[PDB]
């Protein structure tokens, strides 16, 4: 047919990569560090969280 | 043709809808019973 | 007093060598029914001087099971002699 | 691992879900696609450290070791098809699924984030290996060898649980290797001997000493279809690496009793390779090579202070690729002559010319010809244990002598002739026979260009 | 016959409730008195002269094991006269208590209660009913628990697996191989009972499940180990794969869920600075596995299906509650972070 | 002469050690309902004399 | 015939159908004497569902629909191949007798299954007891060995426990060995020259072996002549019908007897003859070998997957 | 009872080599009675004066072991360097085990009686040396 | 008894298993 | 620990409740999803996609029961810590305040190789 | 055929009387394949009273 047996199964990568992101968005404890690691004034250490 | 017993076929389809609606009403109540108590 | 030592010495009518041995198994079921009255009496001496007023129904109920128990055990001892004619505890076939 | 386990479990409802004989091509197709994704997020930087996500991964940061674990399911399916294709498809679907089920637990192993997550996954194997040993072998002495593979591995690993649960409620909790900043030292006592000894001895039973190697030429001698779990059982032996995770810390100051493990495994090294030159079973010839220069790491871990961890890491995947291929050289050339007796296969080197290079470039990695991944590994071990005591160059030098005469004895038995027999042995080493014999030396000499990828912390 | 077979079978579990629902030593006497009255018919049903010569070896072993219990009551009747089920106020009573009750659960002394009954009862069908009599006295040792001598309860339990282990390597009859390793799984739970008496029930609920699902697998034809060969290629080859999975689970291997108790039960046995006690037993149940390997070396390697007899017909027994047993007896090891907070 | 002997002598002695003592415990449990119960009594008396059991 | 416990407590099946119409009857006979000249002729008037004797294809004659699958999968010793009576062979000529006994037992296990289900009498051709008469001249002719004779002799005390005996059992009119002309004139090209050692010995073995069941309480009706031919037809029709209730039983031995009160003779034979896979359940073979009754592990252990195409013919989804 | 150990483990500690092996043959002598009692009960009836269990030599063996089992220690406790040590008390293992090696002939029993007994010998005094406790409570 | 095939090479070339789409098994392993 | 013989008592109202799309509740019944496939495989079905009405109601069973089971598991840890912190709060003599000392106080072993 | 050694002797060495592992002892008995009824001996010649010149 459209072969869900085939390449639809490596499409579980992004399905797994969706669950890969959900942890670090609740692992958001510290913007307070001292080794660059700053989150001093800027919109650089805030982003990609 | 198809020949099942035609008696219980649907009791399994009728118990779940009894169970799930009893579950979700117990869940949608208890989702509010937290804030009603806390 | 000494009315309890005799009879606590008389509780040793179990004595296990003569609780299943030797043959004529009726001799062993004998002391199983005779191990009562060493419990029926040893209870009755204690409930009666110390006026409990309620636990003395328990020695009445102590006979009622042990009679029905031993009567069941005596039913099977016919079945060992219904197949043989002799009880003889040195009958053994099913190993362990 | 974010999701490497999550695609490689999705391989499993693909095999039975497929059609007829397409089941070989469907599995090997997608299994190669993980090798991009395995490389992809990993090999990052790099200076103290990469804690990865959560309680499930420390990313195998300073010891990569895991890309090699993912070659093999698309390396063994092309190898196993030689004499497997007479059974039912219902069992041919089984033997692919438990093989994937062996790769699942190895992926959460080597990373494992903990020490108690390690053990339950350290012991989560040995059930799918034992199924490949007992079913799918040849004639008997499978079944006792199925029991010698147990009862060494399992008798030793149970005093881990007595000691690892003992640490978990003594000093904080072991759950992280990065809560191992507070470590009290372990002095000389009569109870702290056994804490060191029980925690260590369960690793010795897999990577063997000279004693207790008695199970290693049992499972490898009598062995599945074409080395099919024998390739796995050589990784699994070097997948008892976790002594590198433990003994670097966690009783760091007990070298006082290293000496019955040194001398047993340093004199045993010079003897257990010497005891193989009179072998008559060809698959048991390789099986003692795997004893000898694996046991060189045991005197390379217990001796601390790197310039050894430079080499002790490079030796784990030195013969990860070498001793795999040597089994593949012997899983081939048995399909044609039905004996593993090394006497019988003579009259060769004229009949199969294209695989003469595959013999030599295998056996030229034990001679090891310094620009490879091999004599960049040994010559850090040599320059390490020189600085322990100077006298150790003697035994380790005679180790280099005898294995030179040992590797060529397997080559030179094929350079003879007149063949005397053999109306069979026609098949001129087909396209599959060279393909699965390749992809071994093609990464093995490639990584010698920039082998900074193969290094510890260090 | 059919209706009265329920009323006998119904009162077996009604005998054991009164053992649990009681505040009074007289009622726990009645409780597993009438169990010893209402098991004797189930032994009989087809009237074979081994069965009659087996229940009578069963009988008087559980008459004396009854009778010493009432002796233990009347001693601490004299001392302080309270009859609630609690600590027994006398070391001459509690000593006579625990090693009286050790016959009904049979420990390593009081030996041959277990093989000599279960072997050769022609009712091999079940005889799953010998899980109630392991369940009634364990409900008595939950209360008596803070009054024991701590040496006797371990010495009956250290001997338990050392002699329940050795006893069955010399066997073929798979009822005895089920009768053995039933003292061993009574060895792990009463070695723990002085230390935190819950996380004992975890071992028991697991033991009911894994043993009940073993007998239901056995009810196609299986009698002897040689008969356990001749059904792989004849009855169903999926049966051979299933009978592998439970045994390897019941040996305690960490990919399955019979490793769920030990893993938790050593969390309690050490934490109490007792280390040489689990290291003996944990290495002892290793040759409790050489039953199961060398049993799995029969059915799962096509060992001689000869004497060509075809079962060209389907199977219609009643494998009741079987579809859900090897899905909680194997796959539960990840799904129990706290089973010991439901049962606690 | 050594690797298959004096490593194989000591540990597969244990196979032949336990099965030497796994025979003394079915073949001496040969029935004898007279001799179950004479051996329960030795166990019941030796608990009185031995140790902690009355203390 | 009972259907579980739940149906059994409402309506029982011991005696409300068997209103003396049990009448479980068989014949014994000899070769070419009592085949269907007398046996099949009497179904009516008395309402007796006839069953055939034997053959390799009885298991093929059940479970369906229904056409007989060939002798490869049901590998036996091949009616009209063993007439070479191979006294020295691989072989085996005994391996016929195993499948001869198990095709025999399922007819008698469907016999009792049919009666309490319906209430009809059943004529059999040769019961489970006739199988030992062949063994007398199977022994003295040299094509059998000992340590195969004892095997089914050990099965006989194992598999025959609950079987109530037949009722007016007829030894058919049997000649004075005129079967030597009957085996020739009636065709039978492969039933051939083999002399009186197989003829006379089984005839001597009908009398001294079958006598205890003939002396068991169920009265027999014996003839020894050429045939019935309206002389023993009606005489074994009318005066056996008078022997069905009146001159019928002495120790009574078969009645679905005094435990017909929802007890051990009412369900516990009619629940253990239903689903006939538990009936040949102790038909498992030797300890290991027996040197004749074998099948190798994987060849011909690989003759099973050929007979296992889909393993169940038709069942579809959604049901 | 436990007080036998409270006169064994308390007073001598290597010295006084007669009372050491006088008390340490009581315990091992007593266990010959325990192996005698099951060998007349679990084994069938012996000759006319039970216990006459089949091969005999039971209490003949057991008390002989504990007779030397202090004696091999208390000699070698003081003569070398005067503590009690795990290597001190190791010596009583092998030749203490070889009583069972001497009778019921060796070459397959006796050295195996020597070897394993030396393993379980030294661990006992090692036990109180680290303060080991088998049957404990919180 | 015993039945084992030979040099899966009936003059044809052959890579892995047989003639066709098993021909595509090379270009899924080589590529 | 009071209010004996309840499945789960009244005082479990202020606990979250353990709402769905938690992976255990996906896993509870995933084994039941595996179990219904076994239920066909025992009986020579020979489908492995058989009657869905048998293949359903296993999913409904485990998920409902497993949810109603987990409401007391999260209770029992919540009542566990609730009684520990009170006994921490009383009796300060069993719970001292340790001194904060940096790495200028410790002289450790020092053992180099 | 070829695959392994599933030989006959592995059934008789596991042949079920007692599983004699390391020795041969007083075995039990080749236990019954059917349900267990060997010892059928139940008979008596009933009482021979003469109510004669009584
Ligand atoms: C008509 C044709 C159409 C037009 C074609 C285009 C025109 C030609 C292309 C121009 C030249 C590019 C060719 C690349 C090779 C030479 C490069 C070079 O010398 O300068 C280095 C030059 C460095 O660039 P840079 O700007 O100076 O510095 C950047 C780096 O920091 C520098 O440091 P680094 O990080 O690179 O580290 C050095 C080291 C590090 O790299 C490695 O070690 C990786 C190799 C081992 C991998 C092991 C891990 C595997 C797991 O690199 C090397 O190994 C050099 C060895 C030769 C390249 C290895 C090829 C890899 C295979 O290039 C490279 O290192 C990259 C090489 C990439 C290879 C491309 C593949 C080419 C294949 C061509 C096949 C032709 C077949 C013809 C048939 C012949 C029949 C007889
Ligand atoms: C309901 C409780 C009241 C207590 C009554 C206890 C039984 C009293 C005896 C009733 C006598 C009735 C005699 C005529 C019955 C008609 C015959 C018939 O068709 O059989 C029906 C019979 C009546 O029993 P039955 O006693 O007449 O004869 C049956 C034969 N035996 C005893 C061997 C089973 O019903 C049954 O067989 C089912 C009941 C099983 C046995 C009774 C014990 C349990 C009672 C139900 C709970
Ligand atoms: C009238 C009583 C009828 C019920 C009798 C049931 C027969 C006995 C069944 C034995 C099965 C073994 C289960 C033992 C574990 C009990 C399960 C559990 O943890 O929930 C009990 C729960 C929790 O019990 P609990 O917390 O209220 O107090 C009892 C605690 N134990 C059991 C440890 C003593 O009780 C119920 O509410 C039942 C629902
Ligand atoms: C041999 C058996 C001898 C083992 C003796 C037990 C050692 C011990 O006592 O443990 C010491 C210690 C904890 O014990 P403890 O002294 O009470 O600690 C003080 C608490 N305040 O520290 C520990 O927790 C150590 C516990 C782990 C060691 C237990 C296993 C020791 C035996 C393993 C030997 C190696 C494998 C040999 C067995 C396999 C072959 C059969
Ligand atoms: C697709 C299912 C398998 C193919 C159709 C069924 C064919 C079959 O009946 O074989 C069942 C097989 C048992 O193996 P076996 O008994 O040895 O083979 C002889 C069978 N007459 O194997 C079985 O299927 C038995 C059931 C095993 C448990 C289910 C696994 C089957 C795979 C389908 C479910 C996939 C979803 C569950 C697994 C998800 C994994 C992430």
Curated annotation (Swiss-Prot), chain C:
CC per GO annotation: mitochondrial inner membrane; respiratory chain complex I
Broad enzyme group: translocase
EC number: 7.1.1.2
Key words, A-Z: Electron transport, Formylation, Membrane, Mitochondrion, Mitochondrion inner membrane, NAD, Respiratory chain, Translocase, Transmembrane, Transmembrane helix, Transport, Ubiquinone
MF terms in GO: NADH dehydrogenase (ubiquinone) activity
Entry keyword annotation includes Nuclease: no
Entry membrane topology: Multi-pass membrane protein
Annotated localization: Mitochondrion inner membrane
Domain of life: Eukaryota
Function per UniProt: Core subunit of the mitochondrial membrane respiratory chain NADH dehydrogenase (Complex I) which catalyzes electron transfer from NADH through the respiratory chain, using ubiquinone as an electron acceptor. Part of the enzyme membrane arm which is embedded in the lipid bilayer and involved in proton translocation.
Protein name per Swiss-Prot or TrEMBL: NADH-ubiquinone oxidoreductase chain 4L
Organism: Bos taurus (Bovine)
Gene this chain is encoded by: MT-ND4L
Swiss-Prot record, chain F:
Superkingdom of origin organism: Eukaryota
Subcellular location: Mitochondrion inner membrane
Regions that span the bilayer: 31-51
Stated role: Core subunit of the mitochondrial membrane respiratory chain NADH dehydrogenase (Complex I) which catalyzes electron transfer from NADH through the respiratory chain, using ubiquinone as an electron acceptor. Essential for the catalytic activity and assembly of complex I.
Family statement: Belongs to the complex I subunit 5 family.
Subunit-structure text: Core subunit of respiratory chain NADH dehydrogenase (Complex I) which is composed of 45 different subunits.
Protein's UniProt name: NADH-ubiquinone oxidoreductase chain 5
Gene this chain is encoded by: MT-ND5
Residues of the whole record sequence present: 552 to 606 of 606
UniProtKB/Swiss-Prot annotation, chain H:
Keyword Transport on entry: yes
Chain ranges passing through the membrane: 21-42, 57-79
Cell location: Mitochondrion inner membrane
One Pfam family linked to the record: Tim17
Topological type in the membrane: Multi-pass membrane protein
Presence of the UniProt keyword Cytoplasm in the record: no
InterPro entries given in the database record: NDUFA11
N-acetylalanine modified-residue sites: 1
GO process annotations (BP): mitochondrial electron transport, NADH to ubiquinone
GO cellular component: mitochondrial inner membrane; mitochondrion; respiratory chain complex I
Keywords: Acetylation, Electron transport, Membrane, Mitochondrion, Mitochondrion inner membrane, Respiratory chain, Transmembrane, Transmembrane helix, Transport
Ranges in coiled-coil conformation: none
Subunit structure, interactors included: Complex I is composed of 45 different subunits.
Protein role: Accessory subunit of the mitochondrial membrane respiratory chain NADH dehydrogenase (Complex I), that is believed not to be involved in catalysis. Complex I functions in the transfer of electrons from NADH to the respiratory chain. The immediate electron acceptor for the enzyme is believed to be ubiquinone.
Similarity annotation: Belongs to the complex I NDUFA11 subunit family.
Name of the protein: NADH dehydrogenase [ubiquinone] 1 alpha subcomplex subunit 11
Record organism: Bos taurus
UniProtKB/Swiss-Prot annotation, chain J:
Protein location: Mitochondrion inner membrane
Membrane topology: Single-pass membrane protein
UniProt keyword terms in alphabetical order: Acetylation, Electron transport, Membrane, Mitochondrion, Mitochondrion inner membrane, Respiratory chain, Transmembrane, Transmembrane helix, Transport
GO cellular component terms listed in the entry, alphabetical order: mitochondrial inner membrane; mitochondrion; respiratory chain complex I
Post-translational modification: There is a minor unacetylated form of subunit B14.5b.
Keyword match Transmembrane: yes
Residues spanning the membrane: 51-70
Its biological purpose: Accessory subunit of the mitochondrial membrane respiratory chain NADH dehydrogenase (Complex I), that is believed not to be involved in catalysis but required for the complex assembly. Complex I functions in the transfer of electrons from NADH to the respiratory chain. The immediate electron acceptor for the enzyme is believed to be ubiquinone.
Recorded family membership: Belongs to the complex I NDUFC2 subunit family.
Subunit text: Complex I is composed of 45 different subunits. Interacts with TMEM242.
Name of the protein in its database record: NADH dehydrogenase [ubiquinone] 1 subunit C2
Organism from which the protein derives: Bos taurus
Designated gene of the protein: NDUFC2
């Amino acid at each position: 047919r459209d072969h869900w047996v085939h390449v639809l199964v490596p499409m579980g990568f992004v399905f797994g990569y969706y669950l890969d992101r959900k942890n670090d968005e609740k692992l958001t404890a510290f913007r307070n560090k001292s080794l660059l690691y700053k989150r001093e004034l800027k919109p650089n250490e805030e982003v990609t969280w | 043709h198809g020949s099942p017993n035609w008696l219980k076929v649907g009791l399994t389809l009728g118990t779940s809808v009894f169970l799930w609606i009893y579950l979700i009403k117990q869940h949608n109540e208890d989702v509010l019973e937290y804030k009603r108590r806390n | 007093s000494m009315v309890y030592m005799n009879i606590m010495m008389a509780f040793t009518v179990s004595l296990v060598g003569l609780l299943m041995y030797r043959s004529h198994l009726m001799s062993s079921l004998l002391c199983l029914e005779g191990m009562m009255l060493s419990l029926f009496v040893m209870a009755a001496l204690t409930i009666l001087n110390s006026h409990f007023t309620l636990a003395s129904m328990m020695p009445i109920i102590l006979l009622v099971f042990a009679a029905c128990e031993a009567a069941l055990g005596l039913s099977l001892l016919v079945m060992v002699s219904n197949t043989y004619g002799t009880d003889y505890v040195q009958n053994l076939n099913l190993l362990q | 691992m974010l999701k490497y386990i999550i695609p490689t479990i999705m391989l499993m409802p693909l095999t039975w879900l497929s059609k007829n004989n397409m089941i070989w091509v469907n599995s090997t197709a997608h299994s190669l696609l993980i090798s991009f994704t395995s490389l992809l997020l990993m090999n990052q930087f790099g200076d103290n450290s990469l804690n990865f996500s959560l309680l499930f991964f420390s990313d195998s940061l300073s010891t990569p070791l895991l890309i090699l674990t993912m070659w093999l399911l698309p390396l063994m399916l092309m190898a196993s098809q030689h004499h497997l294709s007479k059974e039912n498809l219902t069992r041919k679907k089984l033997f692919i699924t438990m093989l994937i089920s062996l790769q699942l637990f190895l992926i959460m192993t080597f990373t494992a984030m903990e020490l108690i997550l390690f053990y339950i996954l350290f012991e989560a194997t040995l059930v799918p290996t034992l199924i490949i040993i007992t079913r799918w072998g040849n004639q008997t002495e499978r079944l006792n060898a199925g029991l010698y593979f147990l009862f060494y591995t399992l008798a030793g690993s149970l005093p881990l649980l007595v000691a690892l649960i003992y640490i978990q409620n003594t000093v904080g909790s072991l759950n992280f290797l990065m809560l191992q900043y507070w470590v009290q030292p372990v002095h000389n006592s009569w109870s702290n001997v056994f804490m060191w000894l029980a925690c260590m001895m369960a690793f010795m039973v897999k990577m063997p000493l000279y004693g207790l190697h008695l199970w290693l030429p049992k499972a490898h001698v009598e062995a599945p279809i074409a080395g099919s779990m024998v390739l796995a059982a050589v990784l699994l032996k070097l997948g008892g690496y976790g002594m590198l995770r433990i003994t670097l810390i966690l009783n760091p100051m007990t070298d006082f009793m290293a000496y019955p493990f040194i001398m047993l495994s340093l004199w045993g090294m010079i003897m257990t390779s010497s005891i193989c030159l009179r072998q008559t079973d060809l698959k048991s010839l390789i099986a003692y090579s795997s004893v000898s220069h694996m046991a060189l790491v045991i005197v390379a871990i217990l001796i601390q202070t790197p310039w050894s961890y430079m080499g002790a890491t490079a030796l784990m995947i030195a013969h990860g690729l070498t001793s795999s291929m040597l089994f593949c050289l012997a899983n081939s050339n048995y399909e044609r002559i039905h004996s593993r007796t090394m006497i019988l296969a003579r009259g060769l080197q004229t009949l199969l010319p294209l695989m003469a290079t595959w013999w030599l470039l295998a056996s030229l990695t034990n001679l090891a010809l310094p620009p490879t991944i091999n004599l960049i590994g040994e010559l850090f071990v040599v320059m390490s244990t020189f600085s322990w005591s100077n006298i150790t160059i003697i035994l380790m030098g005679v180790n280099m002598v005898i294995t030179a005469l040992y590797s060529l004895y397997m080559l030179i038995m094929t350079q003879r002739g007149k063949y005397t027999y053999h109306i069979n042995n026609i098949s001129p080493s087909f396209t599959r026979e060279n393909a699965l014999m390749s992809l071994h030396i093609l990464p093995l000499l490639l990584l010698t260009l920039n082998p900074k990828i193969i290094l510890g912390p260090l | 016959n059919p209706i009265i077979f329920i009323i006998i079978l119904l009162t077996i579990m009604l005998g054991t409730i009164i053992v649990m629902i009681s505040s009074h030593w007289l009622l726990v006497w009645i409780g597993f008195e009438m169990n010893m009255l209402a098991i004797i018919p189930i032994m009989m049903k087809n009237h074979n002269p081994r069965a009659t010569e087996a229940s009578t070896k069963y009988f008087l072993t559980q008459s004396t094991a009854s009778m010493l219990l009432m002796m233990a009551v009347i001693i601490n009747l004299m001392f302080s006269g309270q009859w609630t089920v609690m600590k027994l106020f006398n070391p001459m009573a509690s000593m006579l208590m625990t090693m009286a009750l050790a016959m009904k659960l049979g420990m390593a002394p009081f030996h041959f209660w277990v093989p000599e009954v279960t072997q050769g009862i022609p009712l091999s069908s079940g005889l799953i009913l010998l899980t109630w009599q392991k369940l009634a006295p364990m409900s008595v040792l939950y209360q008596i628990f803070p009054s024991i001598n701590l040496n006797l309860i371990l010495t009956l339990s250290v001997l338990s697996i050392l002699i329940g282990g050795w006893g069955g390597l010399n066997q073929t009859q798979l009822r005895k191989i089920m009768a053995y390793s039933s003292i061993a799984h009574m060895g792990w739970m009463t070695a723990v009972l002085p230390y935190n008496p819950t996380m004992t029930l975890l071992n028991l609920i697991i033991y009911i499940i894994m043993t009940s699902t073993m007998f239901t697998m056995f009810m196609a034809n299986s009698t002897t180990t040689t008969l356990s060969l001749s059904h792989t290629w004849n009855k169903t080859p999926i049966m051979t794969v299933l009978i592998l999975a439970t045994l390897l689970s019941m040996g305690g291997l960490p990919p399955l869920s019979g490793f769920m108790p030990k893993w938790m039960i050593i969390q309690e046995m050490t934490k109490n600075n007792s280390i040489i006690l689990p290291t003996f037993m944990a290495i002892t149940a290793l040759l409790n596995l050489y039953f199961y390997m060398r049993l799995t070396y029969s059915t799962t390697l096509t060992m001689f299906p000869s004497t060509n007899n075809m079962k060209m017909k389907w199977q219609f027994p009643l494998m009741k509650k079987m579809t859900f047993l090897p899905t909680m007896v194997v796959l539960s090891t990840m799904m129990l972070p706290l089973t010991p907070m439901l049962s606690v | 002469l050594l690797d298959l002997i004096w490593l194989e002598a000591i540990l597969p002695k244990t196979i032949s050690l336990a099965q030497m003592k796994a025979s003394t415990l079915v073949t001496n449990q040969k029935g004898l309902i007279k001799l179950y119960f004479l051996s329960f009594l030795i166990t019941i008396l030796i608990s009185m004399i031995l140790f902690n059991f009355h203390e | 015939l009972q259907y579980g416990p739940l149906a059994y407590i409402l309506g029982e099946k011991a005696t409300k159908k068997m209103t003396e119409k049990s009448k479980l009857i068989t014949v014994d006979g000899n070769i070419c004497s009592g085949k269907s000249k007398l046996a099949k002729e009497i179904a009516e008037k008395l309402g007796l569902k006839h069953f055939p004797e034997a053959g390799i294809h009885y298991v093929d004659s059940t479970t369906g629909d229904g056409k007989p699958l060939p002798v490869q999968f049901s590998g036996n010793c091949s009616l009209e191949k063993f007439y070479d009576d191979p006294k020295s062979n691989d072989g085996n000529s005994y391996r016929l007798q195993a499948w001869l006994y198990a095709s025999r037992l399922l007819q008698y296990a469907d016999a009792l299954e049919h009666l309490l289900s319906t209430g009809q009498g059943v004529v059999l051709e040769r019961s489970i007891y006739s199988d030992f008469v062949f063994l007398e001249a199977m022994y003295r002719q040299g094509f059998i060995r000992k340590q195969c004779v004892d095997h089914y002799n050990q099965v006989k005390k194992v598999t025959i426990c609950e079987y109530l005996p037949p009722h007016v059992v007829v030894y058919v009119d049997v000649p004075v060995p005129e079967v030597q002309s009957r085996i020739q004139k009636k065709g039978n090209p492969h039933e051939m020259k083999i002399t009186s050692a197989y003829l006379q010995d089984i005839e001597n073995a009908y009398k001294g072996t079958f006598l205890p069941e003939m002396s068991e309480k169920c009265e027999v009706l014996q003839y020894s002549a050429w045939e019935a031919q309206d002389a023993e037809k009606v005489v074994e029709d009318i005066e056996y019908l008078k022997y069905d209730k009146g001159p019928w039983l002495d120790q009574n031995d078969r009645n679905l007897h005094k435990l017909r009160m929802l007890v051990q003779d009412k369900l516990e034979v009619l629940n253990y003859t239903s689903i006939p896979v538990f009936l040949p359940e102790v038909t498992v073979g030797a300890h290991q070998s027996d040197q004749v009754f074998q099948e190798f592990t994987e060849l011909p252990g690989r003759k099973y997957r050929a007979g296992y195409n889909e393993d169940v013919g038709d069942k579809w989804i959604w049901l | 009872a436990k007080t036998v150990l409270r006169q064994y483990w308390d007073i001598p500690e290597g010295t006084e080599c007669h009372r050491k092996t006088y008390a340490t043959t009581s315990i091992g002598g007593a266990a010959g009675l325990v192996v005698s009692a099951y060998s007349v009960a679990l084994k069938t009836p012996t000759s006319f004066l039970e216990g006459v269990a089949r091969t005999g030599r039971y209490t003949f063996t057991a008390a002989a072991i504990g007779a030397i089992f202090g004696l091999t220690s208390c000699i070698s406790a003081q003569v070398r360097e005067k503590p009690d040590d795990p290597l001190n008390y190791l010596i009583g293992g092998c030749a203490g085990g070889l009583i069972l090696g001497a009778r019921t002939r060796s070459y397959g029993i006796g050295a195996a009686a020597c070897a394993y007994m030396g393993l379980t010998a030294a661990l006992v005094k090692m036990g109180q040396l680290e303060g080991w406790q088998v049957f404990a409570e919180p | 008894e015993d039945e084992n095939l030979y040099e899966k090479n009936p003059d044809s070339h052959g890579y892995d298993k047989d003639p066709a789409v098993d021909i595509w098994n090379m270009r899924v392993v080589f590529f | 620990g009071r209010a004996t013989f309840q499945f789960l008592p009244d005082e479990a109202r202020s606990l979250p409740p353990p709402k769905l799309t938690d992976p255990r509740l996906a896993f509870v019944g995933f084994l039941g999803y595996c179990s219904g496939l076994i239920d066909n495989a025992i009986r020579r079905r020979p489908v492995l996609l058989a009657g869905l009405h048998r293949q359903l109601l296993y999913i409904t069973s485990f998920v409902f029961v497993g949810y109603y089971l987990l409401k007391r598991q999260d209770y029992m840890y919540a009542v566990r810590d609730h009684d520990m912190f009170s006994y921490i709060k009383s009796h300060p003599e069993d719970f001292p305040e340790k001194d904060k000392k940096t790495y200028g106080e410790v002289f450790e072993e020092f053992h180099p190789v | 055929a070829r695959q392994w050694q599933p030989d006959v002797e592995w059934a008789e060495q596991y042949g079920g009387a007692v599983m004699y592992p390391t020795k041969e002892t007083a075995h039990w008995k080749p236990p019954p394949w059917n349900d267990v009824d060997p010892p059928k001996d139940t008979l008596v010649s009933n009482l021979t009273l003469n109510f004669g010149p009584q």
